[model samples]
Target: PSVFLIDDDRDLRKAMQQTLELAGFTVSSFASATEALAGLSADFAGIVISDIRMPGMDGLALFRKILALDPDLPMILVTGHGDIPMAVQAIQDGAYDFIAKPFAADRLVQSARRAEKKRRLVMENRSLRRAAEAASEGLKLAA
Candidate 1:
C-alpha cells in the first residue's frame, strides 16, 4: 500500500500525497524528478505517479530512468492539455497508464490501484521464474 508521487507543483503534489494517504496508501512526494530519483530504490515495490511536465527531468524522462532501473515498477503518467500524444507514447514505451490533469481523485486512485496490481503480478512472476530456474538446475544435476 505504498506509492511514489512526483510532481513539480508543490501544492498539487502535497494534495495528492495527503489524499492517497487518507485512502490508506503510503505516498512519498517529490518536487522534482531528480529529487525523487535521488531517494528511489532499486527494490521499490510500488506504483509511481508522476506529472509529465517538469523543469528538468520531466515526467517522461523520469519514467524512462525508473523503467531502466526497475522495469517492473508500474508508472502512471499525468499530462496536461496538449500532451496526449506524448502520454500515449509513454504508454507505448511501457508505462502502466496516463491521465490528463484536473482529473478526479477517484480516477487517479483507481489507476494507482491498478498499477499496484500489475506490479505485484510482476513480482510474483519473477518469484516463479526463480523457482523454476532452481528446479531446472536440480533436474540437470539428476540427469
Candidate 2:
C-alpha cells in the first residue's frame, strides 16, 4: 500500500505520482531523499522510484539505505541521462531496474506492478509462516 516517488524536480515527481496513482497505486512523492527516508518503514509494501541525480542523498545512496533496512523491498531508479554504465551498476547493486527520463508511463507502471507483486508475496509468506508457527505451538501444548 506504499509506493514513493522521490525527485528534486517537483513537476516530474508530481507527474509520476499522478501516473502511478492512475494505475491503481497509493503513491507518495518526496522532493528529497532525506524526506523519503523519514517516511519509510518495514511495513512499506510497494516500490520506491527515485531520481539518480538529486540535491542530496542521491538515488543509489538512498537505495542502499533502504535495502539495509528492508532487503527484499524493490527499488527502481529513474534518471534523465540514463547512463548505461550507471544503470548496470545499479542493477548489480541490487536495484530491481533503472529507467531513463522521457519514458513511457507503461514502463514505470509495469515496474511498479512487479514491485507490488513482490510486496504481496512477502506479506503472504510472513502470514503463512506465522500461522504455521502458531499451529505448531498449539499442537506442542496439547501434547
Candidate 3:
C-alpha cells in the first residue's frame, strides 16, 4: 500500500516515514498539504496521513478537497492533545480516523493498513462493475 504523509515537523515526518516503510507502505512525505494535493491522483489507491494543524491549508481543508475528488478516499488526521475536540468533529464528518500526537507507531500502521484494505476493495469493485456494465450494455472506446 501507499501513503501520503504530510507534516511540517521533519523529525516526526522522518520517523513516521521510516515506520510506515518498515510496515510495508510506500510513503511520500510532504511538508505541507499543498504539495500533496498538487501531486495526488484521482485514481490513487493509497491513503493520506496528515497533521491536522499546520501553517497553511490545514489538514481538514485538504481532506475536503480530496473528498470532492473521491469521497471514498481514506484520510487520517493527526492532532495534538489539545485538539481532540477538532478530531472528534472530523470523525463525525466522514474522516477515516484520527490520531493524537505522541501516538504509537503500531496504531498508525494498523489504521493505515485497514484503510488501504478498504480502498483496495472499493477500487477493485469499481473496476469490476465498470466491466460488467460495459459487457452488458457496451461502451465505445474513448480517445
Candidate 4:
C-alpha cells in the first residue's frame, strides 16, 4: 500500500521513506503538511503519517482538513512527549493512531500497514455499495 509521510525534519522523512519502502509500501515523504495536503484526495487508498509539529499547517490541522474530505481516511500522528494529550484528542476525533518520538522502525511500519488494510476494506465496501445501488437503479428502470 501507499503512505504519505510528512515531517519537517528531512532526515527523519528520509529514514521513514526508506523504512516504509523496505517494508513493501509506496511512500511519498513531504517537508510539510501543506505540501502533502496539496496532493491528497478523498480517494487516496493509502494512509497518512505526519509529524505533529511543523513550520506550517500542523498535523492536527491537516488531520481536520483530511477528515473533512474523507472522515475514514486513516491518519497517524507522530508527536513528542508534550503532545500526547493533543494526539489522544486527535485519535478520539478520528485519527488512526499516534506514535511518540524515538519510536522503532517496526512500530511505524506495522501501524502503517494496518491503517492501509483498513482503508482498503473501507474503500472496497464503498465501491460495493455503489455497485449495488447502481444495480438497484437498473432494475427499477427495467421494471
Candidate 5:
C-alpha cells in the first residue's frame, strides 16, 4: 500500500516515485536517510526501498537502524553494479532483497509488490496475536 522510497539522485528519485505511484503504491520519497528516518516508525505498515550510497547516513546505516528499531519491517536495498557484494551482505544481514542500479521499472514494481504483501501479512499476524493476548488477559481478569 505504501513505500518509503529514498534516493539521493533527484532525477532517479522522481522517476521512481512516478513509476511506483503509477503502479498503485503510495510512495513517500525522501532525498536522504535523515529525512526518511524522521517519518519512519515501528508501526509503519509499509516496505522500505533505499539507495545504498547516500550522503550522510548511507543505506547500510539506515538498514541497521531500521532493523534495530523494527526487525519485521521489510527493506530492499538499491545498489550500483559494484555494490552487489555489499548488497548481498545486507540481505544476509536480514534485508528482504537488493536491486542493482539501472534496473527495469517492472522489476522494482514486482519487488515492491512482493515486499508489500509480506509486510501486510506480518502486520496482520501481529494484530491477531495482540488481540488473542488481550482476550486471554480479559478472561484471566474475569476469572
Candidate 6:
C-alpha cells in the first residue's frame, strides 16, 4: 500500500511515516511543502494523507494542486481539532476521509484503504468456496 504522507512539522511527519511503515504501508513522507509534490511528472500510488495546515502551503492548497492531476486518487486529510474546520472543509473539496489527532497509527491503519475493499475479494472467495461446497467439500465438512 503506497501513501504520500505530508506534514509541515518534521517530528509529526516522521512520526506518522514510521507509524504507517511499521504497519507495512509504503510511505513517502515530506517535511516541506515546496518539495512535497512528486519529483517527476507523476501519477502516484494509492492515497494522499496530509496535514490540512502546512507552512509553505496548506493541505487544502496542496490538495487543490494535487487535484490538477487525474486518476482521482483518494485524499486523506488529518490534524488536531484546532483545524477541524479545514479538515471538515476539506471534506467539501472531496477526500477519501478526514482524521483527528493524538490518534494512534493503528487508527490510521484502519482508516487506510487496505481496510477499504478487501471485502470484494472476500466476497469473491465466498463464491468460490461455496462453489467448491456445491461441487462437494460438503461431504467432509457436513459430517
The CA-based lDDT of model 2 is what? Answer: 0.87
lDDT, candidates in the order shown: 0.83, 0.87, 0.89, 0.88, 0.90, 0.68
Which residue runs does candidate 2 get wrong by more than 4 Å? 134-143
List model 4 lDDT by residue over 1-143, tens digit each. Answer: 98899999898899989999999999988988988998999889989999888897888899999999899899998876436568668878988988998999889988998999999999999888877865444335443
Considering only N, C-alpha and C atoms within 3 Å, which residue pairs clash in candidate 6? none
lDDT of 5: 0.90
* lDDT, candidate 1, at 66: 90
RMSD of 3: 2.6
What C-alpha root-mean-square deviation, in Å, does candidate 1 show against the real structure? 3.1
lDDT of 2 by residue, 1-143 (tens): 56988999988888999999899989888988989989998777777889988897888899999989898889999999668788888899899879998899999999889888988899788778878865454334443
The lDDT, on a scale of 0 to 1, for candidate 1 is 0.83
Cα lDDT tens digits, model 6, 1-143, are 77788887788888888888887778878865457675412344456778866677877677777667632656677877446566667778876677888787777888775533442344455567777746653246433
For model 6, the stretches where C-alpha displacement exceeds 4 angstroms are 40-42, 81-84, 114-143
CA lDDT of 97 in candidate 1?
A: 88
Q: Predicted candidate 6: what Cα RMSD to the true structure?
A: 10.2
Residue pairs clashing in model 4 are none
Tens digits of per-residue lDDT for model 3 on 1-143? 99999998899999999999999999999998999999898799999999877878988999999889898999998877437668778899889988888899889999999999999999898788877855555556768
Question: What value of lDDT does candidate 3 attain over all alpha carbons?
Answer: 0.89
Q: How many Å off is the CA of 136 in candidate 5? A: 4.2
Write down the TM-score of every candidate. 0.84, 0.88, 0.89, 0.89, 0.89, 0.69
Clashes of each: 0, 0, 0, 0, 0, 0
